[PDB]
Amino acid sequence: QTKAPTAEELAAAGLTLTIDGEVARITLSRPHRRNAMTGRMWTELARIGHTLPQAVRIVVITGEGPTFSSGIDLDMFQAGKVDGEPTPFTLTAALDQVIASYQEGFLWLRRADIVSIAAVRGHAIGAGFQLALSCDIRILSDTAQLCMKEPALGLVPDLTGTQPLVELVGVNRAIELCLTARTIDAAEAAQLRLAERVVADAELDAAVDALVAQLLAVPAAAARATKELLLQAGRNDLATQARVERTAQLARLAELAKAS
Amino acid sequence: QTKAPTAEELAAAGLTLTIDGEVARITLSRPHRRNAMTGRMWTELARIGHTLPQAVRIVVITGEGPTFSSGIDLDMFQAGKVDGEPTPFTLTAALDQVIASYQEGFLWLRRADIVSIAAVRGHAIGAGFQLALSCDIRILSDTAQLCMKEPALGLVPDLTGTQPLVELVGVNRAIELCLTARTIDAAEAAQLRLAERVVADAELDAAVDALVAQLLAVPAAAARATKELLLQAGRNDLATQARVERTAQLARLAELAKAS
Amino acid sequence: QTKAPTAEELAAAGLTLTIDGEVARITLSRPHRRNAMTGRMWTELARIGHTLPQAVRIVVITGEGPTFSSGIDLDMFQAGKVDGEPTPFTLTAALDQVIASYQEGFLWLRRADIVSIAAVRGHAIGAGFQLALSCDIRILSDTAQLCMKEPALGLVPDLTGTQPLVELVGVNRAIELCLTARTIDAAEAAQLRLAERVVADAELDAAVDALVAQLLAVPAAAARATKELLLQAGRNDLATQARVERTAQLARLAELAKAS
Numbered sequence: 001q002t003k004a005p006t007a008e009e010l011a012a013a014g015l016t017l018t019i020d021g022e023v024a025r026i027t028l029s030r031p032h033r034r035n036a037m038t039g040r041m042w043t044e045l046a047r048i049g050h051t052l053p054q055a056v057r058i059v060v061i062t063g064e065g066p067t068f069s070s071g072i073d074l075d076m077f078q079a080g081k082v083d084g085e086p087t088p089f090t091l092t093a094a095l096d097q098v099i100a101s102y103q104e105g106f107l108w109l110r111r112a113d114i115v116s117i118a119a120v121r122g123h124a125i126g127a128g129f130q131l132a133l134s135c136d137i138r139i140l141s142d143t144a145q146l147c148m149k150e151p152a153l154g155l156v157p158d159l160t161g162t163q164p165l166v167e168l169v170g171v172n173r174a175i176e177l178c179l180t181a182r183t184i185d186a187a188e189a190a191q192l193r194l195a196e197r198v199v200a201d202a203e204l205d206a207a208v209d210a211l212v213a214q215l216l217a218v219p220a221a222a223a224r225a226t227k228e229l230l231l232q233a234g235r236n237d238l239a240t241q242a243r244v245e246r247t248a249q250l251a252r253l254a255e256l257a258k259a260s
Numbered sequence: 261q262t263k264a265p266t267a268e269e270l271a272a273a274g275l276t277l278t279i280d281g282e283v284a285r286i287t288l289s290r291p292h293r294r295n296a297m298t299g300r301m302w303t304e305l306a307r308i309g310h311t312l313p314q315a316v317r318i319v320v321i322t323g324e325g326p327t328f329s330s331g332i333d334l335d336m337f338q339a340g341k342v343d344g345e346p347t348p349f350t351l352t353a354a355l356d357q358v359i360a361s362y363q364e365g366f367l368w369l370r371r372a373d374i375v376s377i378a379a380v381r382g383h384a385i386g387a388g389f390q391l392a393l394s395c396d397i398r399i400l401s402d403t404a405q406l407c408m409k410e411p412a413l414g415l416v417p418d419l420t421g422t423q424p425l426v427e428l429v430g431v432n433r434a435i436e437l438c439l440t441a442r443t444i445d446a447a448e449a450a451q452l453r454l455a456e457r458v459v460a461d462a463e464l465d466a467a468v469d470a471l472v473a474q475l476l477a478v479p480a481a482a483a484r485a486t487k488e489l490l491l492q493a494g495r496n497d498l499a500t501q502a503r504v505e506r507t508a509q510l511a512r513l514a515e516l517a518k519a520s
Numbered sequence: 521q522t523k524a525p526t527a528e529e530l531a532a533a534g535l536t537l538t539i540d541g542e543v544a545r546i547t548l549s550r551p552h553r554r555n556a557m558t559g560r561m562w563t564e565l566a567r568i569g570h571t572l573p574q575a576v577r578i579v580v581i582t583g584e585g586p587t588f589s590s591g592i593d594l595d596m597f598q599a600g601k602v603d604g605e606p607t608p609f610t611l612t613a614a615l616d617q618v619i620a621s622y623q624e625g626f627l628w629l630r631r632a633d634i635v636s637i638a639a640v641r642g643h644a645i646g647a648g649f650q651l652a653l654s655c656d657i658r659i660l661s662d663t664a665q666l667c668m669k670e671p672a673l674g675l676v677p678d679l680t681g682t683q684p685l686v687e688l689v690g691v692n693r694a695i696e697l698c699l700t701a702r703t704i705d706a707a708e709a710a711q712l713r714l715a716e717r718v719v720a721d722a723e724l725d726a727a728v729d730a731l732v733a734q735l736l737a738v739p740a741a742a743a744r745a746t747k748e749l750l751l752q753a754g755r756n757d758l759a760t761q762a763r764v765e766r767t768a769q770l771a772r773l774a775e776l777a778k779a780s
Contacts, residue, residue, distance in 0.1 A: 089777075092770050099766045110758060115439055136435045151742040154776055156749055158769035163761045166753040167430055170687055174750050175656045176716055179635055179743045180734040196436055214440040222411040223439045229416055230434050233426040235757065237495065238370060241423045246359045249418035250352050256414055257349075375699055396695045427690055456696055474700040482671040483699045489676055490694050493686040497755065498630060501683045506619045509678035510612050516674055517609075 004051040005044055013044040013083060016064075022220075023212060024056045031065030036073035037127045039098070040083030042105035042159075049108030057220055058212055059109070061135060062119040062204075069128030071149060099158060106134040106160040112228035115215055119208045120144045121201060123183075126153075130161030133168075136227075139211065140195040141204045144186045152181035167234075168193050225252060264311040265304055273304040273343060276324075282480075283472060284316045291325030296333035297387045299358070300343030302365035302419075309368030317480055318472055319369070321395060322379040322464075329388030331409060359418060366394040366420040372488035375475055379468045380404045381461060383443075386413075390421030393428075396487075399471065400455040401464045404446045412441035427494075428453050485512060524571040525564055533564040533603060536584075542740075543732060544576045551585030556593035557647045559618070560603030562625035562679075569628030577740055578732055579629070581655060582639040582724075589648030591669060619678060626654040626680040632748035635735055639728045640664045641721060643703075646673075650681030653688075656747075659731065660715040661724045664706045672701035687754075688713050745772060 010017055014030040014037075026048060028035035052059075063069055075082045077089055088095060109116040118132040121141035126149040132138050148165070150157045157165075157178065166174045169192045177184070189195045199207045215223070225248045233241055270277055274290040274297075286308060288295035312319075323329055335342045337349055348355060369376040378392040381401035386409040392398050408425070410417045417425075417438065426434045429452045437444070449455045459467045475483070485508045493501055530537055534550040534557075546568060548555035572579075583589055595602045597609055608615060629636040638652040641661035646669040652658050668685070670677045677685075677698065686694045689712045697704070709715045719727045735743070745768045753761055 088773060092774070095770060095773070096766060099769060100762075103762050103766065107758070107762065115435065136432055138432075151738045151746050154739050154742045155772050156742060156746045156765060156768045158765040160758065160762050160765065162749050162765055163753045163756065163758055164432070166750055168432060170713060171750055171754065172656055172658075172684070172688060173713065173716060174753075175635065175747055176731075178746045178750060179738055180731070181738050182734060193430060193433065196433060211436075211440070214442060218411045218439055218441050219414050222414045222416060226411050226416045226438045227435055229422050230426055230431055230438060233423045233434075234431065235495075235755075236423065238367070238420065238423055242360075242363050242367065242420050245416060245418040245420065245422055246356060246363065248416045249359060250355060252415050253348060253355070254352070375695065396692055398692075424692070428692060453690060453693065456693060471696075471700070474702060478671045478699055478701050479674050482674045482676060486671050486676045486698045487695055489682050490686055490691055490698060493683045493694075494691065495755075496683065498627070498680065498683055502620075502623050502627065502680050505676060505678040505680065505682055506616060506623065508676045509619060510615060512675050513608060513615070514612070 001047075001050065005047045010044060010048075013040045014038065015041060015044055015048070017048055019053065019056060022055055022216060023058045023060065024052060025060045025062075028061075028063045028069055031063070031067070033073065034067040034070035034123070035063045035065070035128070036070045037131075038073045038076060038083045039085050039087070039102060042102040043085075045105035046101065046108065049105070049111075052114075057114055057223065058215055059114050059116045060119060060208055060212070061116065061131065062208075063121065065122075066143070067122040068118075068120045068124040068144070069131065070123060071126030071128045103158070103160055106131065109134045109136070110231070112231065113224045115223070115227070117208060117211060119204055120146075120195075121204060123147070125149050126157075127159050130157060130159040133161045133164040134159075137211065138195045139204065139207050140186045140189055140198045141201040142186050142198055143201050144189065144195070144198075145183050146189055146194065147181065147183040148178045149181050151178055221255060222252060261307075261310065265307045270304060270308075273300045274298065275301060275304055275308070277308055279313065279316060282315055282476060283318045283320065284312060285320045285322075288321075288323045288329055291323070291327070293333065294327040294330035294383070295323045295325070295388070296330045297391075298333045298336060298343045299345050299347070299362060302362040303345075305365035306361065306368065309365070309371075312374075317374055317483065318475055319374050319376045320379060320468055320472070321376065321391065322468075323381065325382075326403070327382040328378075328380045328384040328404070329391065330383060331386030331388045363418070363420055366391065369394045369396070370491070372491065373484045375483070375487070377468060377471060379464055380406075380455075381464060383407070385409050386417075387419050390417060390419040393421045393424040394419075397471065398455045399464065399467050400446045400449055400458045401461040402446050402458055403461050404449065404455070404458075405443050406449055406454065407441065407443040408438045409441050411438055481515060482512060521567075521570065525567045530564060530568075533560045534558065535561060535564055535568070537568055539573065539576060542575055542736060543578045543580065544572060545580045545582075548581075548583045548589055551583070551587070553593065554587040554590035554643070555583045555585070555648070556590045557651075558593045558596060558603045559605050559607070559622060562622040563605075565625035566621065566628065569625070569631075572634075577634055577743065578735055579634050579636045580639060580728055580732070581636065581651065582728075583641065585642075586663070587642040588638075588640045588644040588664070589651065590643060591646030591648045623678070623680055626651065629654045629656070630751070632751065633744045635743070635747070637728060637731060639724055640666075640715075641724060643667070645669050646677075647679050650677060650679040653681045653684040654679075657731065658715045659724065659727050660706045660709055660718045661721040662706050662718055663721050664709065664715070664718075665703050666709055666714065667701065667703040668698045669701050671698055741775060742772060
């Protein structure tokens with residue numbers, strides 16, 4: 001709330017944030033720990049989302065080094081403090097609130113006024129896979145490997161990953177992936193629609209930059225209104241969706257006419 | 261209402277309609293304008309749907325010439341009359357009603373008692389893509405190119421395209437396609453499930469005729485009842501869908517027994 | 521209710537059931553009749569599901585011989601008794617109840633505490649295809665052929681197949697498959713996501729055993745909780761699904777802590 005987290009605050013939580021005009025880049029920045037995630041990292045992610053400047057309309061998430069994220073830092077299942085905050089294992093209404101605070105680090109990636117992109121190389125495991133899933137678009141390196149590992153550890157996926165997983169691959173494949181907890185390669189991810197594009201590792205940065213340029217070339221207000229429409233389409237009946245579309249078009253035509 | 265539009269009325273709106281027994285063929289018929297669509301064309305499409313004879317159970321939509329449709333005629337964004345009716349730009353409750361009248365040209369393609377097929381060659385852009393999306397089945401030529409262009413023009417898709425797009429390719433890919441407004445080729449369309457079949461251009465008419473023959477070989481009442489069931493499946497819980505299926509089967513068994 | 525059906529009772533209904541520890545194997549066992557299904561078979565399937573021991577968490581369904589199932593036994597459309605019970609043709613509230621009893625043979629395959637696998641070779645037609653569809657996972661032999669034949673016979677699919685079909689292939693493809701009643705091969709099934717894996721016929725048993733081993737290696741309670749979450753994901757809004765996930769995680773953390 002109020003002020004954005006500082007670069008120093010973010011560095012202590014394992015993140016870097018750079019903003020250039022309409023594009024924000026968030027980098028997981030603990031390569032020696034394979035970008036293992038902590039509670040503090042998730043709650044700072046939430047803080048970044050709540051305080052981004054209004055002009056930002058694209059958010060790119062990637063990892064420093066060859067691994068996107070190994071998932072949750074195993075110290076989070078020990079008694080003490082991790083990154084200065086108490087672990088779940090320490091702590092049920094209070095645990096419920098902490099988990100809800102962590103989920104807020106992922107939920108904002110669906111906001112209609114941003115397009116979020118995960119640029120994934122190497123392993124995205126567990127919480128790492130759920131971070132990539134929470135983004136609108138995934139661009140994978142040919143090195144990428146994805147795994148919903150939580151059930152293998154006796155846990156469920158609780159960082160908002162279940163819904164996008166089922167939307168991408170269907171409930172049946174989702175069951176297979178989660179209940180085997182198996183690791184899939186980038187070719188398989190592409191086949192299952194988990195990646196919107198797979199490119200050679202050397203080309204991942206250029207592929208993300210090409211997609212950013214394509215998005216910036218579409219006007220901001222139409223992009224936002226259209227994303228808002230698409231997120232409602234699945235759950236609406238057709239008659240309702242047609243009304244919602246029509247309502248949105250009136251606002252576009254209004255803005256365009258006042259503009260000229 | 262009451263009488264079907266005449267061939268002369270349809271020709272002035274850029275359409276041809278031929279009916280042979282149980283099959284109706286609607287052709288966009290302005291090849292020199294790349295079958296660009298107008299308000300009058302949409303409201304005549306709605307009139308065709310409301311007055312088709314009861315025996316028609318299949319509807320095939322294609323374009324005259326090498327382009328299915330370039331989308332909305334740019335004159336629709338000018339002050340005057342297009343095809344004899346006032347433009348949106350001329351005109352908000354009244355604009356809401358006009359848009360709703362245009363949507364009715366697309367909505368009826370989902371009726372349970374028809375199977376609608378879009379046979380697409382060359383470009384289907386914007387309103388043209390939404391027409392193809394509104395059909396049950398798309399058969400593409402290898403020449404086909406699809407593009408949701410509206411956001412690039414500062415507009416949203418409001419001709420009922422959002423829901424089938426999300427059902428076909430998933431919300432994530434839908435965001436990518438709409439917010440980049442990019443053009444996809446037929447091979448990509450096939451990969452994304454946007455086309456049920458892609459064939460050589462010379463073979464498009466034969467492919468449509470083969471599919472028509474397959475549909476006609478299934479009895480009309482079972483086809484209708486089954487389409488009605490499938491359209492309800494996504495939004496129902498499993499227990500409810502099983503009840504709906506069972507209810508439909510009682511009616512089939514009834515009709516079959518009275519038949520014999 | 522109460523006691524499980526005996527092996528003798530099951531054999532008279534065309535089924536075999538073997539249980540080994542956490543894995544139950546149900547085999548359609550009328551190869552000379554291409555495992556054609558009857559009312560008695562469906563209601564025994566329901567009885568198996570209602571009485572399986574608590575320790576069973578995986579259920580494998582396959583056919584004896586080269587055909588999974590030719591679908592409904594044509595005698596079910598004749599006047600008399602089939603397998604000792606009266607046919608639908610004999611018999612509307614009473615017919616409604618009989619059909620609902622048959623559906624219960626398929627519905628239990630979605631229970632959260634089991635993973636159900638259909639191992640399909642040769643033809644799975646009509647009721648046979650709906651049995652395979654009702655399972656969480658399908659592994660196909662390269663010999664497999666699938667067909668939703670009901671509409672061709674003047675019927676609808678009423679054994680709970682419509683919803684999984686639409687979830688797998690999308691409503692549009694579902695319409696095409698059901699309203700043409702056409703037969704698809706295993707390569708096509710794989711392309712359409714109807715099969716989670718296709719393997720050489722000689723390798724089908726090993727492929728199923730590999731998947732079973734993968735499932736058994738994930739703890740039972742996390743598997744169950746995760747399947748329960750995934751089945752709710754499609755119909756929930758994102759905020760609701762995040763709450764459901766969080767609720768499930770509290771129970772996991774509880775059980776794990778009491779465990780240690």
